[PDB]
Amino acid sequence: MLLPWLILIPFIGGFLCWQTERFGVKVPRWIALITMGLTLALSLQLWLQGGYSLTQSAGIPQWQSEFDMPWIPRFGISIHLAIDGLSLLMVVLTGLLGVLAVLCSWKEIEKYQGFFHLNLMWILGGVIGVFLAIDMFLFFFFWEMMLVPMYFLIALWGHKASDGKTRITAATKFFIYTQASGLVMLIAILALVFVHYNATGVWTFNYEELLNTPMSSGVEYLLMLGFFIAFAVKMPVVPLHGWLPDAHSQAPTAGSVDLAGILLKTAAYGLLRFSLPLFPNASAEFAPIAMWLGVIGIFYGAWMAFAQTDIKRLIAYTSVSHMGFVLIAIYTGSQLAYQGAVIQMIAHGLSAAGLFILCGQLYERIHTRDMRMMGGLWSKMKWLPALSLFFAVATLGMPGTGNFVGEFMILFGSFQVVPVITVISTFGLVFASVYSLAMLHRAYFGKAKSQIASQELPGMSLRELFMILLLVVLLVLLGFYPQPILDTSHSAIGNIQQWFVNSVT
Amino acid sequence: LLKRDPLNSMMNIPAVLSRFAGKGLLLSENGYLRWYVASMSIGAVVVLALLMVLR
Amino acid sequence: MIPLQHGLILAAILFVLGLTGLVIRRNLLFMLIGLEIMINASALAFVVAGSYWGQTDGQVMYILAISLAAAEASIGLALLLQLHRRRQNLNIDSVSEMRG
Amino acid sequence: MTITPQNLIALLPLLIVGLTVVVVMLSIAWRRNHFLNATLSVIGLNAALVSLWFVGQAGAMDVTPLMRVDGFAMLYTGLVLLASLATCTFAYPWLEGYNDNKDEFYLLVLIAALGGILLANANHLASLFLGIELISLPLFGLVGYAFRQKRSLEASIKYTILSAAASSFLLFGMALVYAQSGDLSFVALGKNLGDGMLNEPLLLAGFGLMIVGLGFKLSLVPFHLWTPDVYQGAPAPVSTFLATASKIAIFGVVMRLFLYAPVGDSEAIRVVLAIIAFASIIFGNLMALSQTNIKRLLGYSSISHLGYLLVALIALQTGEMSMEAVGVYLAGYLFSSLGAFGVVSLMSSPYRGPDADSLFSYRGLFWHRPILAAVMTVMMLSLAGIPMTLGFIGKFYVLAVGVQAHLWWLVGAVVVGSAIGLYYYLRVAVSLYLHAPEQPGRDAPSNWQYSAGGIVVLISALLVLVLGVWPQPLISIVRLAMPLM
Numbered sequence A: 001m002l003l004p005w006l007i008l009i010p011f012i013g014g015f016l017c018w019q020t021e022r023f024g025v026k027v028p029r030w031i032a033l034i035t036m037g038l039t040l041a042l043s044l045q046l047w048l049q050g051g052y053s054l055t056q057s058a059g060i061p062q063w064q065s066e067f068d069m070p071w072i073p074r075f076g077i078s079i080h081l082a083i084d085g086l087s088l089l090m091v092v093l094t095g096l097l098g099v100l101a102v103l104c105s106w107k108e109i110e111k112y113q114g115f116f117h118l119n120l121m122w123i124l125g126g127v128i129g130v131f132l133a134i135d136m137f138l139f140f141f142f143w144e145m146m147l148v149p150m151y152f153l154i155a156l157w158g159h160k161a162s163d164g165k166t167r168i169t170a171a172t173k174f175f176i177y178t179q180a181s182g183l184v185m186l187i188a189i190l191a192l193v194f195v196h197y198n199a200t201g202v203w204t205f206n207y208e209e210l211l212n213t214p215m216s217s218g219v220e221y222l223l224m225l226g227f228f229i230a231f232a233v234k235m236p237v238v239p240l241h242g243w244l245p246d247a248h249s250q251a252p253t254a255g256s257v258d259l260a261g262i263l264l265k266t267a268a269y270g271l272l273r274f275s276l277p278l279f280p281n282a283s284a285e286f287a288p289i290a291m292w293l294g295v296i297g298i299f300y301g302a303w304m305a306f307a308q309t310d311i312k313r314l315i316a317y318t319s320v321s322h323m324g325f326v327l328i329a330i331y332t333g334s335q336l337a338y339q340g341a342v343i344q345m346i347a348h349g350l351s352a353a354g355l356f357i358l359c360g361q362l363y364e365r366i367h368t369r370d371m372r373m374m375g376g377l378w379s380k381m382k383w384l385p386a387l388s389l390f391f392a393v394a395t396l397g398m399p400g401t402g403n404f405v406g407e408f409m410i411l412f413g414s415f416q417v418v419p420v421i422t423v424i425s426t427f428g429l430v431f432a433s434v435y436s437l438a439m440l441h442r443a444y445f446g447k448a449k450s451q452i453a454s455q456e457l458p459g460m461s462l463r464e465l466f467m468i469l470l471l472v473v474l475l476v477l478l479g480f481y482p483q484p485i486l487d488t489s490h491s492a493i494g495n496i497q498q499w500f501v502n503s504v505t
Numbered sequence B: 001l002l003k004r005d006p007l008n009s010m011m012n013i014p015a016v017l018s019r020f021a022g023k024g025l026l027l028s029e030n031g032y033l034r035w036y037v038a039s040m041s042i043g044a045v046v047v048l049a050l051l052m053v054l055r
Numbered sequence C: 001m002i003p004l005q006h007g008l009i010l011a012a013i014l015f016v017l018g019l020t021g022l023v024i025r026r027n028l029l030f031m032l033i034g035l036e037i038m039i040n041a042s043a044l045a046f047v048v049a050g051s052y053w054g055q056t057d058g059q060v061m062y063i064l065a066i067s068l069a070a071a072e073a074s075i076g077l078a079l080l081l082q083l084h085r086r087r088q089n090l091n092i093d094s095v096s097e098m099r100g
Numbered sequence D: 001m002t003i004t005p006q007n008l009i010a011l012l013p014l015l016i017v018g019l020t021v022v023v024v025m026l027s028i029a030w031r032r033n034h035f036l037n038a039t040l041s042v043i044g045l046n047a048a049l050v051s052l053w054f055v056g057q058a059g060a061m062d063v064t065p066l067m068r069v070d071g072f073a074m075l076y077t078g079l080v081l082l083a084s085l086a087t088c089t090f091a092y093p094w095l096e097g098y099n100d101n102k103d104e105f106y107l108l109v110l111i112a113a114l115g116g117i118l119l120a121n122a123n124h125l126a127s128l129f130l131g132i133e134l135i136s137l138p139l140f141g142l143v144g145y146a147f148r149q150k151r152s153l154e155a156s157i158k159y160t161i162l163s164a165a166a167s168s169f170l171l172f173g174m175a176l177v178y179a180q181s182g183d184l185s186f187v188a189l190g191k192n193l194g195d196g197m198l199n200e201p202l203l204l205a206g207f208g209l210m211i212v213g214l215g216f217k218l219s220l221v222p223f224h225l226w227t228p229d230v231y232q233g234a235p236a237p238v239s240t241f242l243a244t245a246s247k248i249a250i251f252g253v254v255m256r257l258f259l260y261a262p263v264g265d266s267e268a269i270r271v272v273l274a275i276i277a278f279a280s281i282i283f284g285n286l287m288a289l290s291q292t293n294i295k296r297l298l299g300y301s302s303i304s305h306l307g308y309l310l311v312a313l314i315a316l317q318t319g320e321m322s323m324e325a326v327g328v329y330l331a332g333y334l335f336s337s338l339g340a341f342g343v344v345s346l347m348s349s350p351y352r353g354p355d356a357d358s359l360f361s362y363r364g365l366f367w368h369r370p371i372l373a374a375v376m377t378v379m380m381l382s383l384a385g386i387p388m389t390l391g392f393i394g395k396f397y398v399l400a401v402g403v404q405a406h407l408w409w410l411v412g413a414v415v416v417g418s419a420i421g422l423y424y425y426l427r428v429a430v431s432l433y434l435h436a437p438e439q440p441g442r443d444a445p446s447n448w449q450y451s452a453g454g455i456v457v458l459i460s461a462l463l464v465l466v467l468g469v470w471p472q473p474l475i476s477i478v479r480l481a482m483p484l485m
């Protein structure tokens, strides 16, 4: 199977990136690009050979490919990997964002750049493993391993303007939030493994076997909450979001960590792949609380974004507001909302990526991220201001940008299940418009509010233009023709939706 | 009102309490050995007392 | 015949007296003297127990205990000498530089 | 039992280390020779490690009423011998700068190792009492080897007085247990009690007074106030042994005692042990949160790690993974501790007076000692329990044993304690790659003996990472090392 190589190539390339700095400080970047290019090519090959569009839901579990190798036999833990329309779509996004993460940090050719790329490649290897792992321990291991590289990238290669103290403070907060939450999930994985043994007599960590574990209402609820705590920190779900704005602000200014370790939806997939299938009844009775937490994140994130001054922290809070819609959808039991969640998870990744990459490029010219020191940048630059407007139009969810397809599909499906929550949630589209236009008016429109913004700035390079324009084409195509993506995730999302509904009944 | 993310400050209480508790516990770390000996005396009484009330 | 309980209480009284001595005295010498009372009291208890069970094990444990007391007092008084030679002061409260 | 030729084979490790203590002493008598005497010590300790093969082939057997040789004994004997060979490799570079008698250091390391091997095979209260004193009295001199240093003398006086007090509580407790039992063997402690009569007041009181002594040696609250002061004052080579050999040797005999002793399954003792574990897990991490001395930080860290291990002891009479968990955890703690303390030793060698203990000394280690910074990072991640490190596999075992035993308060403490711990461990790790323009750092020695210490901390880091990703090899070995029940 090739599934194992979607995780190995990134890891092997990371080692090569470090061992090739001896041939020059301009070599590691090419090794990283080839590494991510090969993983992306392999992902596309799997897409063109799986016939996902013609796969009909046969019921969980339903994998197009699977690999199993003994890892820790004593505990029945193995390297079990499996692909599906949902997982495939998340792996190809990781490959695309990984190539862009390498291209964005291309002018960074300082010493120890090999270790930078090693950490970047390993963050991506872990993310791909999280989307492929079907062994509960492998899932947890990949969930927690990807955090160590991220910690050192935010603390040692973080915002060039921030002091070491501020960067470390942010990295520690991110790690403690995430590793501790992940540990609460291990406690629940271990409890599920023991409840299975006691109820049946088998010792397994395989998701396929633990899918129907006879358990009481109380234990199922506690086990479900344990997984949710881990998926609430990475989504994020308010009030476990404080770590996000800080990490984004102190992360490599170029935007590499932002795209690789913060824009891949490993928590939304986790809620759809494990929480909903493993604990169907508990998820159904927690739906009200989860959906209301999402509504709060929609308005709280929007208000927090409006008052940010820092452009990168503004974009960071917009993510909390947008992910609230996905949380509401995951707990509706509607195929339309689930399919829309998949589109939004992909669209937000592309729209947020563009904003984060453009933010880094802007810093390279004005050496500031404070919007109070910008203004009239539309008349001082050649592309950045116009392209930032596009990504903000997509962020507010303009029809024709792909973010609209996901957001409206979620609302249409959610309305059929929870009408009142859908009505209040739709008003979030007005708040989005407020923060989206606020950022454009406070940075590119009006008059220069500082001297640096009052001089013609260097123009965007071909590399910068290519990566940003690629994201523009993808968002527009996803907005006008989203069917090819919907046809790939239909079987997987159908299996999950049926399981949840049928199990609750 | 929300400009400073109030809910984040609320989730920072677990860390303010931790630092405070650490400083209070370190107050028992006075280099005085006679106190260290008294600490073991107090511990012995507590352990033996609990063993008798939980017997 | 002596009640086993009476013998064990004698040892307990000498043990608690020795401990009180180790905590109330600031002089390293009186602290080392207090420890000798405590270890002698523990050895006495073993002899009382071995006598109640009519076994030589009580006296065997006493021999191991007095061997430790001999070795511990030897090393203990050596450190007292070093402290006196360098600081000419046996107040243990002064030996408290490392803290926090 | 008597000493048969077969029983003598099971004693090879104890006999070889004992002969080394004599030959090395006769060598010092003939002529003081730092190199030869250190070499003779290492050769004897290695011979003992190799003899473990012959002991295993012979099979489990009770040599006398005081010792039982089995897989558990072999495993803990190996652990103490490894931690002791490392202590010697770390001492030579340091003792090179010590302008005084240095051969006695190795003589004391050998006698302390003999204490750990006895504690590994101990099946009787006499063996337990003697093994602790054989691993403590030599350490009084090792903790105060640099008596001319004020901190080393303070550390020695503190350990000696407190250890002596702890030995009296232990003996008095054992005496009270004997008064009720009539037999000093572990299997007889609680055997004479009838059904529902296990909680005999005096038997529980004896164990309680014994716990004061054992808890002190294992740095468990409320007998832990000595750890930070002694760990900091003791010479760095010694701190490595005190943090590894003593703790592993004493924790192992406690496991065998609570396993063989019928009274071990007392709820009162279990509930008391549980309070100690909870406090140790929380207090240790909270007190290390603001430490600016690496030695004191690693001291408070030991308090929490031993608290995590106690959870497996509390879940001993409920599962079988309890013994396996402690083996795997202690193996990881050994390599992780030898790595961190060993790097401190190498950065404090040769002896020039005070040791490099301030975290400021390590604020740019990578830009001077690259491999040493990398090792320290790996060990800091291992001691934090971060997946990809052996330390995590040990934590996984503890959490699994706890969940199967429904120790929910304790499992919750391990999570909160680990979260608190991540703050200080990561701080020390990231500090190594920061830039400290100030360079008061001393130049590294250039002898193969110093380079050997660097290899020890490097191999220990490689093991922590290889076994952190592939732990089945270690799990298989520890599973073979099971007590003779």
Ligand SMILES: CCCCCCCCCCCCCCCCCC(=O)OC[C@H](COP(=O)(O)OCCN)OC(=O)CCCCCCCCCCCCCCCCC
Pocket: A168, A169, A172, A173, A176, A177, A178, A180, A181, A184, A229, A233, A240, B011, B012, B013, B014, B015, B016, B018, B019, D289, D415, D416, D419, D420, D421, D423
């Ligand atoms: C079930 C609950 C709901 C779900 C929870 C999901 C997981 C949440 C995990 C995080 C919990 C809240 C943590 C809040 C603080 C986050 C950052 C942190 O730990 O400390 C940051 C703080 C900043 O200060 P400093 O680093 O010194 O920088 C210079 C001065 N500003 O540094 C400090 O000075 C603080 C020093 C102590 C840091 C460690 C102790 C704080 C956390 C203790 C454990 C809390 C409970 C976690 C339990 C597991 C997860 C549920």
Ligand SMILES: CCCCCCCCCCCCCCCCCC(=O)OC[C@H](COP(=O)(O)OCCN)OC(=O)CCCCCCCCCCCCCCCCC
Pocket: D049, D050, D051, D052, D053, D055, D056, D057, D058, D059, D060, D070, D071, D074, D075, D076, D077, D078, D079, D331, D463, D474, D477, D478, D480, D481
């Ligand atoms: C060929 C001769 C020349 C070479 C000599 C050997 C060279 C190397 C010497 C150093 C290492 C020695 C280790 C020996 C382990 C094997 C011992 C053995 O015999 O294993 C089998 C033994 C049971 O044997 P037996 O009773 O005969 O079986 C009857 C079955 N019906 O079962 C046991 O006793 C279990 C043994 C395994 C558990 C204890 C291991 C102790 C040693 C390691 C300590 C450290 C552990 C951590 C290491 C981490 C490494 C990454």
Ligand SMILES: [Cl-]
Pocket: D369, D370, D371, D372
């Ligand atoms: Cl080096």
